[PDB]
């Protein structure tokens, strides 16, 4: 199918408690494969998936250096952002970054990504053209002008079209037994009386990968979006994910309800009922 490679970076200031912590985690789809944490006793790019361990020391050494430099860059960014917003040196603030590339089944670039948030709010993003920026406010406009002056977009484009896609293709080949394997959900419906009048039907999906899934309840073929309780998709800890959806139904009407499951790992979508 289609695949993505994404780095998720968080830098957070902590006045009075040292320099801002920088953590970067890299993913292919829903699989983490590297981490770097400036708070580690000896910071270095460290493997977090078995298929990346085969890369030699030059991979580790070069990426560690890029991440040590990125730590300094994000600290510079935090200092600059504090000024752009006229903020006190007393408070803690957060800069987050997401960047990487998406490819299709054939490995061709679908699109690239490079965007930032400050204190939880979108700040600046590289547009899909990989040549221009979208700035959220007058502070981000300063960043934009600086990045335009320095032709930053051209460097990001070269990275996203070249290096990112090349490495993602390599990772997918080396990890083909897992990264290219979709595990379908194991599904069941449970039934929990609430009162004499009503019961909960809960539709379960367990053991699936990747995380993307659609779980819905219908009553007489009609979607019950408003009356369905859907928990957020959650990690099991063994690479796979879990989710459930629940509806409260009148006693005796259980067979009018169907749970529908869509997922990449299923030969066909499932239609489940209680029992």
């Amino acid at each position: 199918g289609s695949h993505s490679m994404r780095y998720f970076d968080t830098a957070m200031s902590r006045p009075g408690r040292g320099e801002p912590r920088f953590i970067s985690v890299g993913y292919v789809d829903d699989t983490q494969f590297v981490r770097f944490d400036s708070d580690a006793a000896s910071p270095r790019e460290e493997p977090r998936a078995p298929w990346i361990e085969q890369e030699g020391p030059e991979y580790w050494d070069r990426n560690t250096q890029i991440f040590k430099t990125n730590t300094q860059t994000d600290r510079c960014s935090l200092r600059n952002l504090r000024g752009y917003y006229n903020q006190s040196e007393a408070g803690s603030h957060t800069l987050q970054s997401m960047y990487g590339c998406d490819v299709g089944p054939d490995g061709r670039l679908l699109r690239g990504h490079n965007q930032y948030a400050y204190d939880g709010k979108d700040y600046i993003a590289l547009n899909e053209d990989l040549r221009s920026w979208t700035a959220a406010d007058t502070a981000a406009q300063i960043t934009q002008r600086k990045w335009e002056a320095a032709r930053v977009a051209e460097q990001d484009r070269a990275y996203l079209e070249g290096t990112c896609v090349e490495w993602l293709r390599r990772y997918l080949e080396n990890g083909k037994d897992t990264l290219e394997r979709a595990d379908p959900p194991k599904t069941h419906v449970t039934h929990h009386p609430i009162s004499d009048h009503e019961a909960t039907l809960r539709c379960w999906a367990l053991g699936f990968y990747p995380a993307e899934i659609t779980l819905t309840w219908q009553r007489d073929g009609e979607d019950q979006t408003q009356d369905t309780e859907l928990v957020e998709t959650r990690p099991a800890g063994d690479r796979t994910f879990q989710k459930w959806a629940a509806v409260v139904v009148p006693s005796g009407e259980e067979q009018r309800y169907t749970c529908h499951v869509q997922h990449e790992g299923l030969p066909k979508p499932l239609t489940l009922r209680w029992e």
Partner: peptide, 9 residues
Amino acid sequence: AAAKKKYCL
């Protein structure tokens, strides 16, 4: 290398 060089905001 695999990781991206970042630029100061």
